[PDB]
Amino acid sequence: HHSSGVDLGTENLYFQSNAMAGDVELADRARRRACRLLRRWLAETHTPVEPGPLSLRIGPVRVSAEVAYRSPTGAHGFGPIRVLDAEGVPVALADPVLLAAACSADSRSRSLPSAPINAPDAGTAVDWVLSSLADDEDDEVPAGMTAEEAVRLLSRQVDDLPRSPGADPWSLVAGPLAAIGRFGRAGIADECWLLEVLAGRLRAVDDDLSRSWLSSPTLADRAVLVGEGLRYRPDVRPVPFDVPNPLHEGKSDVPPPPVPVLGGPWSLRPVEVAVHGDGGPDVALVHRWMNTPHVAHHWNQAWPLERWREELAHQLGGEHSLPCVVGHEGREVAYLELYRVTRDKLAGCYPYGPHDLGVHIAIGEREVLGRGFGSSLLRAVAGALLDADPRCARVVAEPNVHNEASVRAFAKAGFVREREIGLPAKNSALMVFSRV
Amino acid sequence: HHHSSGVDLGTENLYFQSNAMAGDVELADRARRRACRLLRRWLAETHTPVEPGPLSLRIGPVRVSAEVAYRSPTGAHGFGPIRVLDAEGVPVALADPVLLAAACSADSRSRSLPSAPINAPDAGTAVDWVLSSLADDEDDEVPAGMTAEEAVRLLSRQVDDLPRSPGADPWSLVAGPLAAIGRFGRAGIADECWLLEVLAGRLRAVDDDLSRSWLSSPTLADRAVLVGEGLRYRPDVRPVPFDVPNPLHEGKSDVPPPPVPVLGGPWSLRPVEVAVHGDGGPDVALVHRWMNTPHVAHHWNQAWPLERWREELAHQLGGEHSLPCVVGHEGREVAYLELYRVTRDKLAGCYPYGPHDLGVHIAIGEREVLGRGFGSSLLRAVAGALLDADPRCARVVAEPNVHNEASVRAFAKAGFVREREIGLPAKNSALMVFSRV
Ligand SMILES: [Mg+2]
Ligand SMILES: [Mg+2]
Predict the structure, then answer these.
(1) What's domain A266-434's superfamily in CATH?
(2) B135/A contact by beta carbon, under 8 A
(3) Which of A7, A171, B263, B380 is the least buried, fewest Cβ under 10 Å from its Cβ?
(4) Residue A166 to residues A3, A160, A202, A386, B105: CA-CA distances in angstroms?
(5) Is the CATH number of domain B267-435 3.40.50.300?
(6) Residue A85 and residue B52: Cβ atoms within 8 Å?
C-alpha cells in the first residue's frame, strides 16, 4: 500500500543493494577513462607536465588536477579531475564524456573551419566516447607484478616488433613505451630504468628501425583528439603526429643562434639589456610593442616592464633564443626571436635536424608602416640565417593556423606548410624554409 | 632530492589535498541532481510512461536504466542510480549529466527532420547547453524540515501570482504551482495528490477564464528543452511549447470502444476474425504476411511470427482500445488498419483531445493493387465514415513518424492537417488531424 513507490521487503533491499555494489567499480572505470582522455590531450597538445597542480583551459571549461605521478612517457597518475568556475571554485567532476565534449570543442576550434575535423559529416570525439562505453575494459597491470616479470614482458614485446620495412612507425610508442608507462604508474618499476633496459633490447636487434629508434629525437604517434584531419565514424580515424623520443639524449653541443646579417632595407641587431637600473630602451621597446593589442593578440605576452626585462636577459644568457630589434630604413619596426629548435618546444613536434632554427616575429610599427613588407622581412631572415649557419638545414616557424596573414607571409617568402601541429595554446601551421 | 616523479609530502600537503577532497561528495551529488533533471525532461517530452520500480529505455546510442523509487503524479520522479547498460544488461557506466545530454541530443536530433531548426548546422546542442551551465548557481533545495502547512502556504501564494489574463503564458501553471508540488512531493513534505486537491480549490475560487480551463482540459502547456523540431541552444536553451497530461484532470469517461465504420463505393471494411482453433484463421495469416513484407515492416516494425500476431489481434478485439480491420478495394483484401480510441492510447498525453477522438494506423499490403494515389482516397473515406459512425467524435487523428513523409503527404491530401510534431516513446510523429469542424 504505497502508490508512489514499491512496497519494500528484505528481498527488495537485497536485489537493489547487490546492484549498488558494482557502482563503485563503475565510478573507477569512468575515472580511468577520463584519465586516458586527459593523457592524450596533454600529449597531442604537447603540454608540459610537472608533479603538482595542473591547470588547463579546455574549450569552454577550466580543468584542474593534481599530478601525483609524473611519467616520463606521459602515463601520468592524477588525483580527481575537476572543472573550476572563473573564480576557481570546483563545480563538477570531469567525467569522460564531459572531457570528450570539452576536448572536441577545443580541438574543432583549434583547427581551421575548412578542416576535415570540422566537416558536417565528420562526427565528434563525443560520438566516439559514447559509442565505446560498452567496450571490454583492458586488464590492469597486476599490482603485485615483479620488476623481472616486467622486464620479461617488455623484452617479448620489443622482439615481437616487426622491425621489417613497411612496419608501423608508431608501434614503438603504442607497444613497449605504453607498457613502460603502465608499469611505472602501477608502481612496478622506475620508468627511467625500464627505458634503459629498452635501449639495450634495441641495441641488440641492430635492425633498421632499432638504430633509428635509438638516435632520432622524435617518434611517430597517433592522435585521437587534436588534428585537423580527424574523423569519428563514430569510431576514431587517428592521424599521425610526432612526440619526443624518451630514449634520446638531453642537451646537444649545438651553439646558440647566430646573428645573421639581412640584406635589402633591413637591419638586425641583438637586444641590449643594461644590468644597470631600468634595463634600457630595448627592454622598453619590446615591452611597449608586446603590450599593444595587435601584438598581444598573437604573442599573449602583455607583461609588465620588469617581467620582460628579465625574459630578455634570460634569453641572452642562454643558448636557446636570441631576441633582436629589426630596423627598416633607419626605423626600429619589429622584434624577433631566433631560436635553436633543439632547445625549444618545437623539438617535440617534428623530426628536426640538430641545427634547425626558428623565428618568432612581432611587427611593432605596423600602426604607421608596412604593407607587403611581411614576406620580404621573413625571406631576408630565412636566407640570412642559412648563410650564417652552414650546418643549419632549414628555418622554421609555427604561426597559428588562424593567423592567416602571417601564414601567407611565410608562404610567399618561400616557407612551405609541412603539417599542422598541436601546441599548448594553439594549433600551428609548421612553415619550413629548406636549404637546397 | 627524494621524489622526482612526485611532490615530497608533508602533513600540510595532505591537509590541502584533503580539504579539496571533502567537497567532491557534494560535486557527485550535484551531478546526480543534474542527470535526474535531464531524465525527467526526457521522459516528459517523449511521453514515456513511468511506474514505480525498474525503468529501462533506449536513448540514442545507449541503453539507460534506473529504479523509480518515487513515481510523482506531476513527473518529478525520484530515481536510484542511473546506469548505462550493454546489450546483455550489464552496467557499463553511471549516466552523468553530459553523457545523458549527449545521448538525448543524438536521439532528439535523429527524431526530427533534417530540415528542422534543431538540426541546422548552426544550432546549439543540449551538450553545449549542459556544458555552459556547470558553473551556474545551483537551485535552492526544498527545506527537508518544511511543514506541510508551509507547503500549502507557499503554494497558495504562488497560484495568486499567476498572470490570469494579461500576458497569458499557458505554461505558467506547470512551471509554477505544479513544479512546486513536484518538489514538495519529491522531498517528502506532502502527498502530491493532496496538494493537487488543494490546488484545485484555489483555482475554482477565482473562476476567471484560465482557471476554468486548467480544471477542464485533459492537457496542459509545458516547455520542452530536449525534444522538439524547433529547439535552439545559444549556449542556452530556447524552449518550445508542447502539451503534457493535466494532473488536475479527472477523465475516466465512459467512452465506448471504436465503432465499425461503413465505407461505400469501391471500398469495404470489416473487423479481423481470429479463429479459436489452431493456426488462427485466414485473417491472422493475411495480417502476419503483410506485416512481414519489407515495405510494411520498414514503418510498423512489427514483422512478428504468426503466433505473436494471432494473440495481438485477439487482445485488441477483446478490448476497448483498438479495433483491427481488413480493408478491401473492389473485392481484393488490400490493407489492414487499426481504429483506436485516443483516450486509451499513447496519444492522450500529447494534445488536448476530446473523449471520443479516434485514430488510424494503416498498412498497405497489396500495393500491387490500387497502385497510385488511392492511399489518400482510402484515408479520406475512413475519416468521413468514422465521423458518421460516432456522432460524438470531434476528429480523426493519426501519428505517422515525421520521417514518413509519403504517409504525411497522403494524410494531408486526404484532408488531414499536419497540426504539430509530438514526442512519443519511440519516435517523433506528425499529428495529422481530420477535424469535424
Ligand atoms: Mg513494507
Ligand atoms: Mg615526505
Answers:
(1) Gcn5-related N-acetyltransferase (GNAT) (3.40.630.30)
(2) yes
(3) A7
(4) 69, 15, 18, 34, 43
(5) no
(6) no
